[PDB]
């Protein structure tokens, strides 16, 4: 039952640098 | 040493918070939440939650620890590094000190603060486990595994004391 939890943890750890690059886009483009 | 055991098993319980129930316990001149009788009776005070507080913080004596909540988190670091969600997600509360009400929620709240949210944890307190190893022994002895590995005499005289180590 752990493999779906590891996939969700990798999903959060992949979406968090996407929000980091979004913060960098809203801070470095305007 | 026998009526006090009945007072502990009937009156004493596990409270939710220790500092908050210390703040409420003052100015108790009229609120019927602390004082209760038994059989001297000889009216009792607010130590009914300070006695199970010793299991959660032994700081009043000064022997070893200052709770139980932190040693499980500070101790379980094993090969199950890939095996740590195998470790913590199955907590079994059993014995004699788990008879007090209000134990499951407070132990769950104290182990929740030091272990991650995403781990699907489960703290289960059953209603049976007064004699729980007796239940395990009567479960194994009826599931026909006792006759496969038998360790007795016929083997104690042929092998001196080297018979209860390799098998069990």
């Amino acid at each position: 039952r752990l493999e779906r939890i590891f996939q969700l943890s990798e999903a959060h750890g992949a979406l968090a640098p996407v929000y980091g690059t979004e913060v960098l886009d809203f801070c470095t483009l305007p | 040493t026998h009526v006090i055991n009945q007072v502990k098993e009937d009156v004493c319980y596990v409270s939710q918070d220790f500092y908050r129930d210390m703040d409420i316990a003052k100015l108790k001149g009229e609120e019927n939440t602390v004082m209760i009788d038994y059989v001297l009776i000889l009216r009792l005070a607010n130590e009914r939650f300070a006695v199970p507080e010793i299991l959660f913080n032994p700081s009043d004596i000064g022997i070893q620890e200052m709770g139980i909540p932190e040693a499980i988190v500070y101790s379980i670091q094993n090969l199950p590094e890939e095996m740590q969600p195998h470790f913590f997600k199955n907590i079994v509360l059993t014995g004699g000190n788990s008879l007090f009400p209000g134990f499951r929620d407070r132990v769950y709240s104290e182990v929740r603060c030091l272990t991650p949210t995403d781990y699907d944890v489960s703290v289960v307190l059953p209603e049976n486990p007064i004699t729980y190893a007796w239940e395990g022994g009567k479960l194994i002895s009826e599931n026909d595994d006792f006759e496969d590995m038998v360790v007795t005499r016929e083997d104690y005289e042929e092998n001196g004391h080297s018979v209860c180590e390799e098998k069990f």
Partner: protein, 405 residues
């Protein structure tokens, strides 16, 4: 509830067909002015017309401030409403042109709902082991997590006291607010640590909070000018960045509404900046109020003009007439105060108070309504009788009886 001077205003009472009711939200009278202000609040809510001006022409003592407050309550909290007294312009250190222009910038506002994640700090994760790479854990009441932060945040960390038991609020733009002394620090039952004793911060790690916020451009100008604005470099830059923010799809502009009292008591240089700056394409709508009639414009000493307004300012301004009333509804208006007051009155005391109101003015009876209830509370009467109001009409005098004596 601490009821103010006038609290009758809760609406303006406009239907869908465009008719005016006789009694709506305690605003009896002037159905023509009711339609004339319904047109301008529809012009405000339509968000297409900027650069207009409204004047409320009437005798002194009609209650046009209540009409402007009804405009502000029909608009509500979405449209920013900032009234300006005419005595707020005569400053000593700041010129009057800049005060009027900053009021015009107080009118224009925007709304750009956004987001912001909170981090809230663990207890102790001072790990400077790399400086580019800092590991900071978090121990909240919901549980424990970890995060890696770039060196900065850490450079803000060593500036403040980072010890055993602190709070670390980290914003999105490396804005760190920190405390000291949390969770538990009662080791040997010793003396004061001299810190803030706070209980457990209940709440999880990752929330996604959304706030709709109205931002005025004058607060933006104050926050950007400091670490009299230049009209070639600063406000043009603000206009360009607001254009970029609304073209990217972040903020939403709302029109500006102002309301100015005692307009005729201003200087003529304020007038020649006023009817020059309302000629701009970005000018907000400003409802002007003239108190008295034909007098001398301040700074002229010979020019005679109606309503104390020059001919260049009196043009291109809509004019709404607000005339006097009929006395047979005055006892209604007192009743509008009675349901505001909470203490019911009798029938003959209403007649005597309406007679005092139609004697000189309504405001004298409105002001004498309060000591009537006060003496009714002192003497023990549950209602206001005729003896208390006929005694308070003789005890307290108006300006006419004071000029008579």
């Amino acid at each position: 509830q601490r009821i103010a001077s006038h609290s009758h205003v809760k609406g303006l009472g406009l239907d869908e067909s465009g008719l005016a009711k006789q009694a709506a939200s305690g605003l009896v009278g002037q159905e023509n002015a009711r339609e004339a202000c319904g047109v301008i609040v529809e012009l405000i809510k339509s968000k297409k017309m900027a650069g207009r001006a409204v004047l409320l022409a009437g005798p002194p003592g009609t209650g046009k401030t209540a009409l402007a407050l009804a405009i502000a309550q029909e608009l509500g909290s979405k449209v920013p409403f900032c009234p300006m007294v005419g005595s707020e312009v005569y400053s000593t250190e700041i010129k009057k042109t800049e005060v009027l222009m900053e009021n015009f910038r107080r009118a224009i506002g925007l709304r750009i709902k956004e987001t912001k994640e909170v981090y809230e700090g663990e207890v102790t994760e001072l790990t400077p082991c790399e400086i580019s790479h800092v590991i900071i854990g978090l121990k909240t009441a919901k549980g424990t997590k970890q995060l890696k932060l770039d060196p900065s945040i850490f450079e803000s960390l060593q500036k403040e006291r980072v010890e055993a038991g602190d709070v670390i609020y980290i914003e999105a733009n490396s804005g760190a607010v920190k405390r000291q002394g949390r969770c538990d620090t009662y080791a040997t039952e010793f003396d004061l640590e001299a810190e803030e004793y706070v209980p457990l911060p209940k709440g999880d790690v990752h929330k996604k909070k959304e706030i709709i916020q109205d931002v005025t451009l004058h607060d933006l100008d104050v926050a950007n000018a400091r670490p009299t604005e230049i009209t070639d470099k600063l406000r043009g830059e603000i206009n360009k960045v607001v254009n970029k923010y609304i073209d990217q799809g972040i903020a939403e502009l709302v029109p500006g509404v102002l309301f100015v009292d005692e307009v005729h008591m201003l200087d003529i240089e304020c007038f020649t900046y006023l009817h020059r700056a309302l000629e701009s394409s970005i000018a907000p709508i400003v409802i002007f109020a003239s108190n008295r009639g034909n007098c001398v414009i301040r700074g002229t000493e010979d020019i005679t003009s109606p309503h104390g307004i020059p001919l260049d300012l009196l043009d291109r301004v809509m004019i709404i007439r607000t005339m006097l009333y009929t006395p047979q509804e005055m006892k209604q208006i007192i009743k509008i105060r009675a349901q505001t007051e909470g203490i019911n009155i009798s029938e003959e005391a209403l007649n005597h108070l309406g007679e005092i109101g139609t004697k000189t003015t309504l405001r004298y009876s409105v002001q004498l309504l309060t000591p009537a209830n006060l003496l009714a509370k002192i003497n023990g009467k549950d209602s206001i009788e005729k003896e208390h109001v006929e005694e308070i009409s003789e005890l307290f005098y108006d300006a006419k009886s004071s000029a008579k004596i």
